[PDB]
Design a protein around this ligand. Structure first.
Ligand SMILES: [Co+2]
Length: 460
């Protein structure tokens, strides 16, 4: 019965198998050249920012907020939006939508520099040791007597966060669920693995490796530095301001500076107003001198939706495409690869070159964003007869950039199976335009293969 009230635990039908992700990748890409395009010398580098972007935007949304799903994630991913209400996953799955719902008509994204969409990425904190994540959702198609089922919840329900994981959204610790008087360094340290166990239980064995400091409470940083699963941290003070083109050291266990850009009291300005102003000032400097725009957010709203669209229209896919909009975990992993991986290219014969690179994350858990960009100097797309890759490469796109050649290499072990899960979702909901768009987006991440061809045929 469509009109009957149901109170359900939000659930998604698949989650990327984070626990199974391989920690070590061995990339081997073979480049075969056209006969009259024999080149004499090639050399390679991993660029400062993925996709050869010019500058970095980092976003972490605190307090495990309902709006991280209903506003932030929904706006990025082309989902139904509301001006005053807060959808849960089960509302979207059932088509039980609030009375003011609308859509932007597009996703919010950059390109990867080689012709594919890269949707904006961000992280949310998680209140994994808080039973309020187990709250149910009221679903009732066609019910208009009230809209209480769409009111803001105190925090995300697990199903919302589980679905966000399928789109690369990151996670971070924040407050832990202890009495205020028990928030000592030692007691917080003991509670981190308790929260971690729930994260792994619910997020298909993903391990959280980030702390967003709560409310200037340094006991959280001191405790987190003794819990070796946490590799990256952020705070407003007692941190390091990130300059992506200048930073030279290890950032293992480093507190990266992140600002909320609160507006002056009574000024009528919003946080997005303040961030926009900071971005404009920063872009006046040469890219090598720019700090990262590293931001925190609390509740997101219509103004934040419009700000995300402004970023898309100005520095993303519909603007100058200069920005890398990501979460701190993906950036941390990329910086680690740039520091420790050493791409090499060797001539195999007169017309064949072999590019090799190892991606090895830290010993605590598999890195979850095992993708890099490699530039080849001395080569152009027009020289190339064919490109082949080994099994560890699951996504591969490439093309000219400025006067050189770039490859975007994705090594997520279960990427093809993940794309097929989105295809199956579309096949089960073939009238859902957003489901078909998601299927095309994920299938387009895959390297050329029989499986990619199969999946493309299923979503024509
Ligand atoms: Co907070």
């Amino acid at each position: 019965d469509n009109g009957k009230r149901r109170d359900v635990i939000c659930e998604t039908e698949f989650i990327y198998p984070f626990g199974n992700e391989t920690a070590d990748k061995e990339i081997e890409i073979t480049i075969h050249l056209k006969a009259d395009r024999q080149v004499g010398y090639l050399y390679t580098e991993i660029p400062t920012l993925k996709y050869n972007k010019d500058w970095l935007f980092l976003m972490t949304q605190d307090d495990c907020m309902h709006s991280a799903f209903s506003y932030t994630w929904a706006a990025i991913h082309g989902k139904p939006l509301s001006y005053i209400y807060y959808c849960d996953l089960a509302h979207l799955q059932n088509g039980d939508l609030p009375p003011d719902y609308y859509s932007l008509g597009k996703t919010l994204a950059t390109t990867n520099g080689t012709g594919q969409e890269v949707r904006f990425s961000f992280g949310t904190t998680v209140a994994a040791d808080d039973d309020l994540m187990n709250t149910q959702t009221w679903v009732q198609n066609g019910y208009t007597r009230d809209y209480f089922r769409f009111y803001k919840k105190t925090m995300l329900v697990w199903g919302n966060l589980q679905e966000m994981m399928n789109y690369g959204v990151s996670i971070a610790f924040h407050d832990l669920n202890l009495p205020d008087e028990d928030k000592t360094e030692d007691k917080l340290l003991a509670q981190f693995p308790v929260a971690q166990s729930m994260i792994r239980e619910k997020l298909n064995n993903r391990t959280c490796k980030m702390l967003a400091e709560p409310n200037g409470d340094k006991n959280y940083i001191k405790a987190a530095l003794r819990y070796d699963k946490i590799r990256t941290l952020c705070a407003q003070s007692g941190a390091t301001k990130l300059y992506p083109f200048q930073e030279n050291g290890d950032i293992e266990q480093v507190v990266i500076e992140r600002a909320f850009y609160d507006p002056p009291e009574g000024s009528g300005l919003t946080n997005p107003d303040m961030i926009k102003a900071a971005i404009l000032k920063e872009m006046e400097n040469p890219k090598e001198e720019r700090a990262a725009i590293s931001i925190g957010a609390h509740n997101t709203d219509t103004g934040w939706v419009n700000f995300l669209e402004w970023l898309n229209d100005t520095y993303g896919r519909d603007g100058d495409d200069s920005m890398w909009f990501t979460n701190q975990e993906e950036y941390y992993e990329y910086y680690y690869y740039r520091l420790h991986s050493k791409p090499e290219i060797k001539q195999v014969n007169t017309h064949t070159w072999k590019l090799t690179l190892n991606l090895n994350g830290e010993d605590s858990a598999p890195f979850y964003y095992p993708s890099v960009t490699v530039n080849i100097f001395g080569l152009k797309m027009g020289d190339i007869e064919s490109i082949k890759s080994n099994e560890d490469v699951t996504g591969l796109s490439y093309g000219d950039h400025k006067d050189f050649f770039m490859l975007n290499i994705d090594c997520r072990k279960y990427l093809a199976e993940h794309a097929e899960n989105f295809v199956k979702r579309y096949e089960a909901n073939p009238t859902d335009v957003s489901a078909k768009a998601d299927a095309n987006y994920f299938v387009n991440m895959l390297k050329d293969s029989d499986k990619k061809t199969e999946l493309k045929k299923r979503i024509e």
